[model samples]
Target: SIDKQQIAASVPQRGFFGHPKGLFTLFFTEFWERFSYYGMRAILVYYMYYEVSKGGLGLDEHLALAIMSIYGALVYMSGIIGGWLADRVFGTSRAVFYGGLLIMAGHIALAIPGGVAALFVSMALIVLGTGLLKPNVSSIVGDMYKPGDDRRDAGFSIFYMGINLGAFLAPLVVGTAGMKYNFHLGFGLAAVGMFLGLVVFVATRKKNLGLAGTYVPNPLTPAEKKKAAAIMAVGAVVIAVLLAILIPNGWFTVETFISLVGILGIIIPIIYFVVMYRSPKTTAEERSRVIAYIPLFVASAMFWAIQEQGSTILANYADKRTQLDVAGIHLSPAWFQSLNPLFIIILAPVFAWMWVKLGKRQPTIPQKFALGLLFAGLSFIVILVPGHLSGGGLVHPIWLVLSYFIVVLGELCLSPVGLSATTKLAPAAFSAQTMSLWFLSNAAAQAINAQLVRFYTPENETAYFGTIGGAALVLGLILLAIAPRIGRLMKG
Candidate 1:
């Protein structure tokens, strides 16, 4: 497991196209997990709001969108807790296994006909499961490489290829299965996707991973386990009481959940900085880096607020405002969901190489963020044009295509670089906390989106696009103006 050479010799060499064989295993692990997630997501909103004739449970359109936003926020926020449970209670191996099981079960629940109740149950399982698996699996990829291994970034790049690959295909396959046949059938396909991942993991994990994720960073002793059990017992009663009080008294709505989590997302990172600065273990430089992270946080939140909407507002846009037929073939609106990933898969390698080629002369982190914002805003702005053309029949699908393509250009700037920037800027005193902190941006973005998305409708489309797009564009320019200051503060 260490420099102990036994595990090293046992590990495969020149495997998985010259990377570790473990990469192949984990590659598909995440691939199928995401396939299931994005597959369900591609059609989930339509399922909620579509009439029973469309095999959907009709619900209020605005509430449905809000639910979707809150669903994403919950997933991201819960990942924080999942990470803690992995590090402190279960090892990464146990966490990922259990997570997959939970995810599969959730999708299976969706495969049934229980309506909104099933949707909630499925969302809960998948959110908690994704929380456990997503971060831990990525972490395990790093574990596959030793310190100073030249293949580290290269390996992660390969893994990301898996991510985009899964996301790219899911909507086309699972979405079609749902749209063309049965909604539950599509969910069944997603469940099968996860089941396949779990099966692969079970078969190859021990050999491929070689004790990588198996190491328990903080194992609870017997007495601690008992105390934990008792604490959980007490926590269960408190949750029940809160639920009873909140639901019956009308204090607990999905809006309340989104706002609570959003506020927590903003507050937690500040707590990370405040505590780190005071810690004797943290250097002044790390504390300064935390201050630098403030500007990046704003940029990240703005970019993600637009980017993650591919499933929610954008989904609605695709269904209601778009022409789902192209030429002779009827295009499934769900297939539109894959456009971002398709663009990402094609463009990412180019971006990867371009960054390397630029080297020292490349844009600094904040400037890259500025570009990210510009592109994201541009995606929203693009929505304005299709309607303006011919003064509007159904909007052409190409507009959506162009929108996804442009935002992906922005994603190429932010998503890849943001991870690296977070690692560099994070204080050592809050290492894992900082990793979760990085993703909290998405959670907060969805939080903001939960409110903003309610304002989107066909009648007010002009104001909706103009207002959101204008705000982002202005803020992006402002970020561009202050990039030099942010870069200066980023002194490591």
Candidate 2:
């Protein structure tokens, strides 16, 4: 004799003091995931560009960066498929576990001492694993609460803090081990972190995620399932066929092929949504909201294209150009990688508290997004100032710290808030899809950023830095102007 109310009561009620225990489960899961991901990220670009003698790939600068870009983009793009699988087939918990295993395997592959073949295999594993883990884990966070629960935002904020916590420590731990000891050791450590995350999910499932295991009564019909399977099979076959054809020709490199497929993968959905909007099935209001998301999506791409400097271009700058000495103490450039996360840890609670204090009068998501772009622009400006001041002399490390602080504040306004907002604004049936679109922005930006970084050479470093800063400023202003309309669409 199961009582419905009792089963409902088993799911924790939302409150400031007593929120869902599942929140912490998701928190740790995301924490460890970020730990491994960011840890690998902190070293990846540097590893790529370093000499082969130093145990790196010995690729040219542009090639290394292009690979990094494609890799970063694919990681985000995979989220689209990851979200689909979680919503339509496997539960979030199982998807996350599968993703985690893939990531572990990927890292282990990287640790193995093979040449180009090993490198590509490792990258493939990571890309596939990340795709599986990224979307599902976040969905589990949403499932921790019922709809419209006030604690939901706060819980996400707390969970996001865990993300930063892992990020903050990762560079110091993994970066040090990788750079100081051996690169393979760092990869092995990253694998261990992924394994730990998988273990945590398995151990805590009964206690924290019991509700997530239950199948919904209205699961997809057999016909729908068959159609989905057919679609996936056809898609895979098409990709394999295209790859075989293109690789034989000079028109596409392996990386380029991946980029094209990923771009197509993302674009197909956007086209579908537009087609849906034109259909009678969609409401007028819903159509308008979806249309408005287009601009926001573009703005997000522009913003992240510059903001992601922390891990890519800016990290490289710190490693190569900036003097890492302060008050007679020399620090590793990798140490500076910790600054953004450290700043996030300190500033996140303040931002969370500010949102709480604002209460019902908090700024809309679009406004926060605008502010994020503005701050990101300012971070570039901060870096630009130092580039100009260098005057053919070495730049001090302080500029990197100052710029990271500004960017970190911007992230506080944007990243976590954006996640919560997407979940809030999306239609129930399309929430995962919308979130995937949001992540796609990151992929697009990273790809563009990679290309932009290639333009940076010794002769044009100053001009490059200045141009990026100026472009970001203009983009920020444009976003600010349209923030109101975007907010209106969200009904904020």
Candidate 3:
């Protein structure tokens, strides 16, 4: 058996730009993971909407959109549970490894030919795996440093760049493979990338992680260990019972089951936090921080709802409304998915530098979030123009590209920083739960965006676009106006 602590101790300590080498390890792992994920996503909707004769799901647009919403929502919602498992049981390191395995299995399952059942099962596995992995991996980044370590934000920026790097390349490579050859091949390639991630993680675990697994020590006391064992056993039994009852009828759709489970996951923790915060055992400052996080959580969800369009409605628009011709060479709509990541790769460092330059004088976190909403609203405006131009004839793909670039810039300002900020601003005890709450916003946003897509009609394209834009604008402005107060509440 391997001695985990001895392995961790063997890791070389070198600071590049004043950060641990482990940061890069986590960065590359995330990069490949995102590559696999975004690569699959680039083709998923297209695969679903394509005719069954063409080896696709052959679902109508509305149904596909609905599934997209549910899938997207569940992905974020699952993060709450993933975070809990990481902090409470598996620890970040083990959670990440298991998550990678599940993701690999999920992608492989997706590549197989089965019917709707195959698709549904594969998606559920992917969603569950992502939920388990995403939040925990992020938390691991935080773990790389002590509390109040200024390098934290910079480390997140580097990690985010890794994500975009993978995102930028995957669609171009995997999308081309899927569009020109077979979708299953693209799915297989995604699995290969995930497998690569797993291999790297396993190889580097001892060399880079530095006793990270020991961060969550095993239950030492008999009573504590027994309680944990009992809880996990009961949870497993409940899931087994539910699956046995539900899978037989096909009445409990994967989406329904995921949604139900996700809601319970969120509610249980939220109730726990509320109880803890309000208890006489808690400090005044702790209660205030939790109160402040409420709005931040809502804001996070709103931000992701509009932001996630890049993978959903926006992709659909690029596929249908935008003209991909460049001097008679037509580009695949899936290729447009790369633009956001491409922009992020190029611009993340620039934004990171700018933030450091403006340190202590820069826009407050709430202000930055509000600006993100504004940028999101502006991106929709850019897309709306193409939608209008598209009615008469195909709009140029450049418009969609431009929209992605702008939205990505906005995301750079909001997302990477926001992740670091959540951990920073939240009270220590509430850190993990607060992060989950931020992700919950993303779930809400996905659901809202899905509903919005359902109401979209050709004749009302302008109205629909305008309404979303306007809502984002109003919400962003409100947040901006109140940001000073919100920042004061953060006590940063």
Candidate 4:
């Protein structure tokens, strides 16, 4: 019968850097989780496409890229399920523990030299684990504060900063080891990272976390629990049966998998929108807000479609197309993955200040998202210059840096702004569902990217960048043109 503040009060406050003692637990937990996640991702694509003699899986280059996009989509999509389970069954604390264990297992699987079969197995565990952990960890952070706590905003800043710090370090460390030594050794280090997170979580959670994440927000009835268990059992068997049939019949090719995920990604959001819009609990004004959100969601999806490519297409470019030697030092392509987060660390504060400096004069949400789309489009266009100038020669690495820089500028415009907007525009009855939609925007984008990356190649570089970048530019302009109309629909 205790309220949120009462649960928060049970937490030991002012122990770690003038914040709650629990911050120490979550900070290290998320730091190491990001370290493992990004560290594993930094080397994964290369591991897929490099020759077996070079200690890689020797998969097709394009197929490997598409798989990367599909993997990202699934990871985010699974968060929806994880969030439900946490709210209804496991509670956030238990979800984090289980998710950490699964993630650690996934990294260990990658560390084993078992072949492509091991790769898919690892993806399954990692995707589901990330879904469970990523969202729930942040929820626990929120759980540590009551509404209107002034410290809340700064607390999030410190927490997210920790994440970027981990993000910045992982590639440099894991990328160097994986590229210079053995991929297995690199993945092994990632497993160690997740293991560290799990240990910290288990050791300190009861003391520091207190009752914050321990209580389920919506516990199921006993009958419902039995029904849920039966449903899960049936679902698992159905999937296994499908796999048994599809694998033997050769119908479970990577292409088919990508297509299936893409369709689901697009379909899920449409269903969410329709359900929310038509829900009896939704008010007329809320329904209008949902309509306003539609274009914003599309804009977010488009922006992320370009931004998430930093991992897939740009990663391949760093390896195959960019100059590796710089001022007499050889560079690892995996190290380039660090640039996006590095820039976010450097530029996020500046953008935050600029927005506050502008105050009421800041660009409206739709306008800012439009700016994001424009910058994302320009990022691709920026890379095209060097490729065209070199006439198919390996271009200077500066182009990649410039491309990442421009996109980060776009991120500053859209990412945080869109999150703020999502909450503001969400119907009261569908608030959490709307936030889920925000995550889905990225999932949908990557799902589409799973198909889009297939069109990219060194020889077709100009055409690929031109077409995709051009589409973004055109969409951004259209969004900008309609911004005023959309803003009015927001009813603010």
Number of the candidate with higher lDDT, 1 or 4: 4
- The CA-based lDDT of model 2 is what? 0.74
lDDT for model 3, on a 0 to 1 scale?
A: 0.76
TM-score of each model, paired residue for residue: 0.93, 0.86, 0.84, 0.97
Candidate that beats the other on lDDT, 2 or 4, i.e. the better one: 4
Over the stretch 382-414, how does candidate 2's per-residue lDDT look in tens digits? 887776766766588888889899987888877
TM-score of 4: 0.97
By TM-score, the best candidate is 4
Model 3 alpha-carbon miss at residue 98, Å: 2.2
Instruction: Supply every candidate's count of residue pairs whose N, Cα or C atoms clash at under 3 angstroms.
Output: 0, 0, 2, 0
lDDT, ranked from best to worst: 4, 1, 3, 2
Candidate 3: which stretches are off by over 4 Å?
1-8, 14-27, 135-159, 207-210, 218-250, 254-277, 284-289, 356-361, 420-428
Full-model lDDT for every candidate: 0.85, 0.74, 0.76, 0.91
lDDT of 4 at 386: 92
Q: Across residues 1-492, which tens digit of lDDT does each residue of candidate 4 receive?
A: 248988987787778888887888999999999999999999999999999999999999998999999999998888989999889998998899999999999999999887999999999999999889988998898877767878888888899998999989999998899999999999999999999999999999888888988888899999999998999999999999998989879589878899999898889889988998899998898898888888889999999999999999999999999999989999999999999999999998899899999998998889999999999999999999998987567899999999999999999999987777787777888776766878899999999999987689777889999998999999999999999978766645
List, residue by residue over 343-427, the lDDT tens digit for candidate 1. Answer: 8878878998999999999998889999999999999899877775557568888889999999999998988778777777878
Q: Candidate 3's residue-wise lDDT over 83-102, tens digit each?
A: 76776677888889889988
Top candidate, metric lDDT = 4
